[PDB]
Design a protein around this ligand. Structure first.
Ligand SMILES: CCCCCCCCCCCCCCCCCC(=O)OC[C@H](COP(=O)([O-])OCC[N+](C)(C)C)OC(=O)CCCCCCCCCCCCCCCCC
Ligand SMILES: CCCCCCCCCCCCCCCCCC(=O)OC[C@H](COP(=O)([O-])OCC[N+](C)(C)C)OC(=O)CCCCCCCCCCCCCCCCC
Ligand SMILES: CCCCCCCCCCCCCCCCCC(=O)OC[C@H](COP(=O)(O)OCCN)OC(=O)CCCCCCCCCCCCCCCCC
Ligand SMILES: CCCCCCCCCCCCCCCCCC(=O)OC[C@H](COP(=O)(O)OCCN)OC(=O)CCCCCCCCCCCCCCCCC
Ligand SMILES: CCCCCCCCCCCCCCCCCC(=O)OC[C@H](COP(=O)(O)OCCN)OC(=O)CCCCCCCCCCCCCCCCC
Lengths: 177, 50, 155, 128, 606, 171, 459
């Protein structure tokens, strides 16, 4: 029950996430593609058999017993994507993700090696500092009484202005610096 | 560091080697033992009666 | 910062409990301080006591290295439950079964090592024969003391 | 049927196996509602203080200062000497000291007694 | 005489010179890794010359050149020892490092800190060449700590990654336990034998040397990653692949076995130490065999493989056969370094994927890597007349016909079968079958650096064992009169293991699903050893650090008994004294009471 | 140069090279290359340096210490004689330490020189090492970090008292 | 010793008659010249100590401490000229005069041939230190830190003076040259028991000893950088020097008397290392590491063997240099992030590479990597305490692990990992700071070449 936009996980998202995790663990269990395809079709049959179940508490009990079934027979070491958390290559390049504001501390001698890039950087900084008050006034007039309810940010609803709090998401370092 | 490196025979640590290089060459030449078990001469020390 | 935002004594009245819950930025029903047994904790909340590895890694955390937000109350043992340190992730195998299996494995192989040490293996040969009174002079023996004569015969 | 998982101190229960997660009562939904409200308000304050172009410094977190002050400077005023604390202090303060003193005294006495009778091997021990 | 010492010290100076070159830079270095590689090749030739000098004559040297510190009776001097072990280890390590740095010049091309990487690798090589040529225990301890902390830095190369720093700290912890053992051994040696030089230790020849040998065994358990202190070596494969291939496979991890090799005149007399260390080696090789049986991450499999090999050389050390163990040191370094090189090439060709379950079909995609991997696996399993035959077969022949433990011999045979099993498991899964990688194929290995390094290590893994085994002089009587069933035992066990694992790999193709058993989970979760020991002991130590040491004693009780008691007593006495009402009558009544007390009770009028 | 008597070395016997095969060993060729390229320039430079040394020759001497009365002829609490006795004892302590270091050097050199037969060929060096270690232990050991001449005298007096008691109980 | 006292006293007319902003330059230049001239104290003989006059003498033990003090003063002036740039000129001159006076008392303490003169300077070092801590600190708790630092030390030192005066009424003199020849054995009695306690508890307090160490985490983390340097690198060695001078008169009662303090220190090193494993503050971590190292020096002095004394003085010099470097690192980080939390500023290797190299080198010298003098001292103390008993090595060895468990930890949380997102005032490293760390480290790395000058008066 930890989501950025919502406060809880519904039944449909629980079933979909259980299906995805079960299929991933089944793919980890059998190495070859044809055996995985056969057993994935079998699991798709098992999930499709109980699709049209209008009894809500029966769906809840089916979810509980399916979760116990998945926990009983999951792989001890499932396959993890290299960029996924817990992978071999996870957060490896965070030692090269230098933040942009370090360029504000560069010497003028080494700032002359890239003139046009720093001119465009000055233009970007001027745009940010001229749109900051407009976007904070947009935020302060749209947030309801008692603070925001969710973490969803409003878009730019006018012409010429930018979406609020756009700097640190647009100017984030790349995945391969 | 140059002054420390060229210290003139610190704590005579070299000298105690060189004198020893003489002294062994004494007592090995005349059949004397290398070192006696008594630091001082036993003839010039008086023990209490027991 | 100011004086009435720092932690204080253990709350007793429900109004003090509500004020401490508002100070720590969470609900009153979820604000459970440490029991006042005199250990020095005070009004610090008792968080559910799990490591930071159990947090969601795909959420847009304010501190993705530690998987922590801004303004959220920290654990009393947050320096112990970082990802560089002790982890409390749910294991696929129960803890007691793992401990009993490891102890049984180690104890069984130690016992069998002792049993094999009691009954060693070898090859059907006599002792190796060395010349010159089992090499008395070559073993560092003194040349003045004549060794006891050991004679090996042809077979 | 299937072996149920036993929760442990160093092996917590899985989130998907928690029975309390599957409750769809009104009170749990309300609790999630103001939990999300508090989290969203704190996040909004943080990212409003964080994206300021005029600001050049550290965004101060009151939670970090609160934790560091509670860990160090707020231990003695919340302490009362009772049976539990006195027993723990007597067991952990002077217990190991007495144990190590007895062990080292016994070892040194045995070694010295071996030295006086000449049974201890000191044939080459001239550096001490 | 003027050529042996001169060439060996100029090898040391030539290796240490590029560190001074990189420490005195102003511009950006133009092809610094090429400079380091050329330096290492020249140093390898310069080290190879005294090796053939020792092969021809048999010259050994002691170079006590710099008198460092005379402390009463003890004298510490910069002493270098040139003997059989140093002369047969230095060119092998230099050749392996040459191939590793060429492969890393191919592999680490895109990293902006490649110069720092090569400086770190050269510093590691310098510390190891300090350690292996060390004469006294102080220089050996210097090399010990140098290679330990260089391993720490090279594991934590990617400092933005959590698991790299965690594994580096774990390796530091286990190496410090090994340092506890080393310090205990050095303490016993100084107290009882009044020396740190190895010549006097070998001359005096103590009889009751159980304590220093136990300390050395603990040090080797810490450094060579034996049972009890193993998991740092499997976790050390979180770093870059050349770092693994050099340090954690061929050079650094054999330092404990090298230390036990050097102390063979002391452990020749002891039988208790030999029995303990044989049992420890057998436990290590069997446990790492079951751990490598059912692993999926390839570098973890080869980590458990090299720890099993370390257990095997400890086993043949414990049967009083040190020179066969040193031959296995060189041979295992060769084929294990080349196997890691092939695995790194395969990983780099598949977009940084280290999982064997998403591989396959690479028999024809990468033919050179396929050939070299097949040759290395054959040499590991004990293919006759390769590198691995000339050490492992003699080791198991000496272990068979000897007065040893039966259980350790049985487990060594089972571990040999399991090595064969996981070797053909790697061959089947990584190389044969059908492709399983993603659709965008960028398989390429035609860079000259990778091809040349794999080619040199392939020539080494084909002929170096034969050349060394025919060049070394005898030191012990080899065993040649054995019955027929004991002579063919290793080949039969390897063949049976290959057959069993081929049957397993054939049965994995069937369309049948099985629930995971307890044995598979035991062999897959690393014997439950990193799950229990890395969660229980840090928790206990940190909770005793906080709930008992920090918060209880030194923040409350030590702050309560001394300062707060007198503080509160002085406060109470100050409040009691100065609480008078200011009345004259009470003051003069107190005067009268004072006079009454002085006159009668205290007898001040006498 | 050094002293061949205080630092002995047994006579060297190098066997003559008597090769059997016709293959030329590279060691002789590399020895010739080392003698041509390396040995001659170093020898020429050292000869030039020695020639420059020979123009300006100056001497340094070994300091000679005359004998002063020791602690056994010093009155109680008279600093002007126990001071000199203490410094003479310290100088003798350092000389004795370097003597034991010389014997240790002899033992290690014998062990490394005699090779695999070191157990038999270096018995005399081992016995000299044992004798000098016994003398050093009986003379200077267990004095403490605050050692002085008086502590050594007290230890010696205790040793002779114990020896007299032992030889009285055996007669 | 009049050739070193007079320039130190003349430093005050230099700092009071200087220009409006030339005080730092002149004081640094002339204190560096004094440090250069300090090397003439290396005229040591194998038997005789260097005796100057009836009041001042220099053995081979006081000489490294004197050289370290006169070397530390210019580093102190360099360190304490960034947070005082906003200060008044008169207050700046007062601070420089306080540092000069403290250094003068320190170099007059070590050369005193009379124990009363040594004790007088040993307490005279209290007033400038207390004034600096209570005036030029940053937090509130410095006021509390002005009490625990003071009334601990005097509580150990006011009985001891009485014992010293008793020696003046017993042996007839307190001159150290006389007492080396007029010493008497101490019989076992309650009077000699309490005289041993009086003569030792001051040096156990000022070292500090575990249990009596409570003033050191408080007086290290509220004090400014110059105060942290003077407590860590010099003022903790007054206890060791006093122990080494006073152990001569307390024989042979020390053999059965040193047991409880040896056990206290042998458990306190483990306790303080475990505390270092869980400290949330950098400055408190360095303070508790100092407590652990000084407990090791206490054990070394108490077992009183030549190897133990050698390891004790080597450990004293090495720990002084390493703790000074660590405190300057912590001061630079505090000046850049304006907080003392360890977990606040992470991943600084991606922003300061050279400061990361200095951090790695300082943490390397902290865990005694060979062949540094830290390893030399700790190794020799380990050899001596193994000679003392065969079990204590365990209580050493485990401690070593915990050392490598926090120092690298002190590295990692400050250097490695993802950098924090909301901190954007991380300036590049100044030339003054890098000069400070190089001047701290290069003598420490150079002393490994010739350690025979820091191996005590019985080398
Ligand atoms: C002392 C207490 C206070 C401490 C703080 C002091 C602050 C003030 C500091 C003043 C200046 C420094 C004083 C101490 C100087 C110590 C150094 C010194 O002089 O030593 C004397 C020693 C003296 O050597 P020696 O004693 O053996 O020689 C006999 C004496 N002389 C020189 C007269 C013949 O100097 C050396 O050892 C220098 C040797 C040559 C230079 C170094 C060559 C090798 C360099 C490294 C090569 C590569 C190795 C591998 C690297 C791998 C990568 C890491
Ligand atoms: C690339 C350019 C190179 C230089 C070009 C110009 C010079 C050319 C060559 C000529 C050089 C000068 C003549 C020869 C050298 C001098 C001869 C001499 O007596 O020198 C004095 C001494 C020789 O020793 P010694 O025996 O004379 O001094 C003993 C001194 N006492 C008695 C006080 C102890 O020093 C050297 O020769 C320097 C050795 C340098 C190599 C070692 C460096 C070690 C660095 C790390 C230190 C820590 C080690 C820890 C481990 C220690 C062991 C356990
Ligand atoms: C070296 C001698 C090699 C030749 C003799 C041993 C042959 C052998 O072990 O055969 C058994 C097995 C193949 O037999 P099987 O699995 O029944 O058939 C499938 C394909 N033939 O397996 C093999 O043929 C592979 C055996 C490889 C052994 C390598 C180590 C020796
Ligand atoms: C020949 C004799 C052989 C004898 C063999 C049997 C005896 C020895 C048995 C082993 C003892 C050591 C192992 C237990 C402690 C291990 C501590 C450690 O560093 O664990 C590693 C752990 C990281 O591991 P991991 O979880 O895999 O990390 C990847 C994350 N997924 O690291 C972490 O999580 C970080 C933890 C940092 C703080 C560690 C605090 C605990 C330290 C305990 C040290 C105990 C030393 C005892 C020395 C005694 C000497 C006499
Ligand atoms: C080992 C040594 C153990 C003893 C160390 C000395 C005593 C403890 C340290 C000094 C006092 C510490 C302190 O700050 O105590 C506070 C307490 C109340 O003082 P207050 O004025 O309320 O606080 C000002 C706000 N900072 O202050 C007090 O209660 C005043 C107590 C003063 C005691 C001075 C020492 C007296 C010793 C002889 C007693 C007879």
């Amino acid at each position: 029950a930890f989501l950025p936009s919502a406060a809880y996980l519904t039944h449909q998202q629980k079933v979909l996430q259980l299906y995805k995790r079960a299929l991933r663990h089944l793919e980890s269990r059998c190495v070859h593609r044809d055996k995985y395809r056969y057993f994935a079709c079998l699991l798709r049959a098992r999930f499709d058999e109980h699709k049209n179940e209008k009894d809500m508490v029966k769906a809840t009990q089916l979810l509980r017993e399916a979760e116990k079934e998945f926990w009983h027979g999951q792989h001890p070491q499932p396959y993890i994507f290299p960029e996924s958390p817990g992978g071999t290559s996870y957060e490896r390049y965070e030692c090269y993700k230098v933040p942009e504001w370090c360029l504000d501390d560069w010497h003028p001698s080494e700032k002359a090696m890239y003139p046009d890039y720093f001119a465009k950087r000055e233009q970007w900084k001027k745009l940010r500092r001229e749109s900051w008050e407009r976007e904070v006034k947009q935020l302060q007039e749209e947030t309801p009484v008692g603070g925001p309810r969710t973490e969803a940010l409003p878009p730019a609803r006018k012409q010429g202005d930018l979406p609020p709090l756009w700097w640190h998401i647009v100017t984030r370092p790349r995945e391969r610096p | 560091s140059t002054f420390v490196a060229y210290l003139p025979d610190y704590r005579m640590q070299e000298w105690a080697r060189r004198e020893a290089e003489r002294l062994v060459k004494y007592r090995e030449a005349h059949g004397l033992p290398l070192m006696e078990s008594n630091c001082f001469d036993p003839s010039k020390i008086q023990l209490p009666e027991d | 910062i100011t004086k009435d935002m720092l932690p204080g004594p253990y709350p007793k009245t429900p109004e003090e409990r509500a004020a401490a819950a508002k100070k720590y930025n969470m609900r009153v029903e979820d604000y459970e301080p440490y029991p006042d047994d005199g250990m020095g904790y005070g009004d610090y909340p008792k968080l559910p006591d799990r490591s930071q590895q159990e947090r969601d890694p795909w959420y847009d955390w304010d501190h993705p290295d530690l998987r922590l937000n801004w303004g959220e109350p920290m654990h009393w043992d947050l320096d112990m439950y970082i990802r560089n340190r002790v982890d409390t992730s749910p294991t696929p195998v129960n803890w007691n079964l793992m401990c009993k299996h490891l102890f049984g494995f180690v104890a069984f192989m130690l016992f069998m090592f002792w049993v094999g040490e009691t009954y060693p293996t070898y090859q059907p040969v006599g002792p190796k024969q060395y010349p010159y009174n089992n090499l008395y002079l070559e073993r560092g023996g003194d040349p003045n003391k004549e060794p006891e004569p050991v004679v090996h015969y042809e077979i | 049927s299937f072996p149920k998982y036993e929760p442990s101190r160093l092996a917590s229960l899985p989130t998907t196996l928690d029975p309390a997660e599957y409750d769809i009562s009104s009170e749990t939904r309300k609790a999630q509602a103001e939990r999300l409200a508090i989290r969203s308000r704190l996040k909004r304050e943080y990212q409003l203080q964080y994206n300021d172009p005029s600001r050049r410094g550290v965004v101060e977190d009151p939670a970090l200062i609160r934790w560091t002050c509670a860990r160090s400077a707020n231990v003695y005023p919340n302490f009362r000497p009772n049976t539990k604390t006195s027993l723990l202090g007597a067991l952990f303060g002077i217990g190991p000291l007495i144990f190590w003193y007895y062990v080292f005294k016994t070892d040194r006495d045995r070694k010295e007694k071996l030295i006086q009778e000449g049974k201890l091997d000191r044939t080459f021990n001239i550096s001490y | 005489m003027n050529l042996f010492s001169s060439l060996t010290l100029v090898t040391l100076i030539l290796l240490t010179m590029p560190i001074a070159a990189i420490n005195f830079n102003t511009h950006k270095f133009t092809n610094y890794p090429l400079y380091v590689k050329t330096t290492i090749s020249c140093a390898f030739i310069t080290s190879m010359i005294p090796t053939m000098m020792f092969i021809h004559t048999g010259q050994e040297m002691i170079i006590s050149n710099w008198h460092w510190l005379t402390i009463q009776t003890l004298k510490l001097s910069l002493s270098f020892k040139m003997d059989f072990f140093s002369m047969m280890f230095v060119p092998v390590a230099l050749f392996v490092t040459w191939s590793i740095m060429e492969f890393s010049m191919w592999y680490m091309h895109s990293d902006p800190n490649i110069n720092q990487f090569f400086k770190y690798l050269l510093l590691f090589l310098i510390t190891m060449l300090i350690l292996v040529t060390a004469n006294n225990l102080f220089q050996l301890f210097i090399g010990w700590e140098g290679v330990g902390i260089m391993s720490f830095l090279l594991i934590g190369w990617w400092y933005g990654r959590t698991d790299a720093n965690t594994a580096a700290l774990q390796a530091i912890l286990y190496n410090r336990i090994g340092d506890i053992g080393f310090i205990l051994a050095m303490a016993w040696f100084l107290i009882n034998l009044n020396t740190w030089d190895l010549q006097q230790i070998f001359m005096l020849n103590p009889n009751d040397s159980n304590l220093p040998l136990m300390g050395l065994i603990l040090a080797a358990t810490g450094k060579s990653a034996q049972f009890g202190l193993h998991p740092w070596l499997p976790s050390a494969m979180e770093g870059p692949t050349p770092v693994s291939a050099l340090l954690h496979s061929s050079t650094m991890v054999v330092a404990g076995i090298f230390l036990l090799i050097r102390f063979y005149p002391l452990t020749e007399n002891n039988k208790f130490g030999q029995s303990i260390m044989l049992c420890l080696g057998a436990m290590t090789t069997l446990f790492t065999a079951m751990c490598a049986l059912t692993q999926n991450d390839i570098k973890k499999i080869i980590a458990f493989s090299t720890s099993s090999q370390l257990g095997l050389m400890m086993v043949t050390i414990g049967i009083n056969q040190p020179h066969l163990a040193f031959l296995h040191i060189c041979t295992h370094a060769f084929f294990k370094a080349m196997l890691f090189m092939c695995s790194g090439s395969i990983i780099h060709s598949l977009n940084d994927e280290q999982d064997i379950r998403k591989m396959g079909g690479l028999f024809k995609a990468m033919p050179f890597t396929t050939t070299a991997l097949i040759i290395g696996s054959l040499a590991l399993t004990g293919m006759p007349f390769l590198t691995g035959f000339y050490s492992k077969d003699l080791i198991i022949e000496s272990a068979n016909t000897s007065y040893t433990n039966a259980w350790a011999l049985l487990m060594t045979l089972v571990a040999t079968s399991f090595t064969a099993i996981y070797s053909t498991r790697i061959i089947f899964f990584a190389l044969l079958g059908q492709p399983r990688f993603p659709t965008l194929i960028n398989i390429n290995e035609n860079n000259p650096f990778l091809i040349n390094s794999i080619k040199r290590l392939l020539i080494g893994s084909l002929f170096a064992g034969f050349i060394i085994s025919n060049n070394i002089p005898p030191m012990t009587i080899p065993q040649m009169t054995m019955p027929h069933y004991l002579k063919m035992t290793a080949l039969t066990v390897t063949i049976l293991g290959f057959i069993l694992a081929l049957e397993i790999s054939n049965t994995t193709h069937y369309l049948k699903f099985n629930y995971p058993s307890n044995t598979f989970k035991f062999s897959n979760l690393l014997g439950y050893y990193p799950t229990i020991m890395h969660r229980l002991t840090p928790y206990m130590n940190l909770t005793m650090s906080q709930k008992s040491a920090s918060s209880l004693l030194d923040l409350i009780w030590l702050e309560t008994i001394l300062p707060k008691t007198i503080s509160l007593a002085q406060m109470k006495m100050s409040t009691t004294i100065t609480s008078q009402k200011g009345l004259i009558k009470l003051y003069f009544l107190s005067f009268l009471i004072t006079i009454l007390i002085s006159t009668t009770l205290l007898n001040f009028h006498e | 140069s050094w002293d061949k008597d205080v630092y002995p070395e047994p006579p060297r016997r190098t066997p003559a090279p008597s090769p059997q095969t016709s293959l030329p060993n590279p060691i002789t060729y590399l020895t010739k290359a080392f003698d041509l390229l390396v040995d001659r320039p170093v020898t020429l430079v050292r000869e030039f340096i020695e020639r420059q040394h020979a123009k300006n020759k100056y001497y340094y001497y070994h300091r000679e210490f005359r004998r002063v009365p020791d602690i056994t002829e010093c009155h109680e609490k008279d600093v002007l004689c126990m001071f000199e006795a203490e410094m003479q004892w310290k100088r003798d302590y350092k000389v004795d330490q370097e003597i034991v270091n010389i014997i240790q050097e002899r033992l290690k050199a014998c062990q490394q020189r005699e090779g695999e037969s070191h157990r038999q060929n270096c018995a005399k060096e081992l016995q000299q090492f044992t004798q000098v270690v016994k003398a050093y232990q009986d003379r200077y050991h267990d004095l403490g970090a605050h050692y002085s001449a008086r502590k050594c005298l007290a230890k010696q007096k205790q040793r002779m008292l114990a020896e007299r008691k032992a030889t009285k109980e055996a007669a | 010793m009049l050739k070193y006292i007079i320039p130190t006293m003349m430093l005050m007319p230099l700092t009071w008659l200087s220009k409006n902003s030339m005080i730092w330059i002149n004081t640094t230049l002339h204190s560096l010249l004094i440090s250069l001239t300090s090397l003439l104290l290396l005229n040591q003989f194998g038997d005789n100590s260097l005796n100057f006059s009836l009041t001042f003498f220099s053995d081979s033990l006081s000489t490294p401490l004197l050289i370290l003090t006169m070397w530390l003063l210019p580093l102190m002036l360099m360190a304490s000229q960034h947070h005082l740039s906003k200060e008044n000129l008169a207050r700046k001159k007062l601070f420089i005069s306080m540092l000069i006076l403290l250094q003068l008392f320190l170099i007059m303490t070590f050369t005193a041939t009379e124990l009363i003169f040594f004790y007088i300077m040993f307490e005279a070092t209290l007033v400038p230190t207390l004034i600096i801590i209570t005036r030029w600190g940053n937090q509130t708790e410095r006021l509390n830190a002005g009490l625990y630092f003071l009334f601990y030390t005097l509580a150990g030192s006011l009985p001891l003076l009485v014992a010293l005066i008793y020696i003046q009424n017993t042996m007839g003199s307190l001159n150290f040259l006389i007492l080396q020849y007029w010493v008497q054995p101490m019989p076992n009695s309650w009077s000699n028991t309490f005289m041993w306690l009086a003569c030792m508890m001051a040096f156990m307090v000022k070292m500090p000893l575990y249990g009596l160490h409570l003033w050191l985490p408080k007086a290290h983390v509220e004090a400014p950088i110059a105060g942290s340097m003077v407590l860590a690198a010099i003022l903790l060695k007054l206890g060791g020097y006093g122990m080494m001078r006073i152990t001569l008169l307390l024989n042979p009662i020390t053999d059965f008397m040193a047991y409880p303090f040896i056990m206290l220190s042998l458990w306190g090193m483990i306790m303080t290392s475990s505390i270092c494993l869980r400290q949330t503050d950098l400055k408190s971590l360095i303070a508790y590491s100092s407590v652990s190292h000084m407990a090791l020096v206490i054990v070394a002095i108490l077992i009183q063997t030549p190897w133990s004394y050698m390891g004790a003085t080597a450990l004293m010099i090495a720990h002084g240099l390493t703790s000074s470097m660590l405190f300057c690192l912590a001061n630079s980080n505090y000046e850049r992030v304006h907080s003392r939390t360890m977990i606040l500023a992470r991943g600084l290797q991606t922003l300061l590479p050279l400061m990361a190299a200095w951090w790695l080198l300082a943490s390397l010298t902290n865990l005694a990597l060979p062949p540094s003098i830290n390893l030399i001292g700790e190794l020799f103390v380990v050899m001596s305490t193994f000679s003392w008993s065969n079990i204590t090595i365990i209580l050493m060895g485990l401690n070593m692990v915990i050392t490598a468990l926090y120092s690298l930890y002190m590295l990692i949380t400050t250097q490695r990992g993802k950098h924090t997102h909301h901190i954007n005032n991380i300036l590049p490293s100044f030339t003054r700071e890098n000069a400070l760390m190089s001047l701290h480290m290069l003598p420490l790395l150079l002393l490994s070449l010739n350690p025979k000058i820091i191996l005590g008066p019985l080398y």
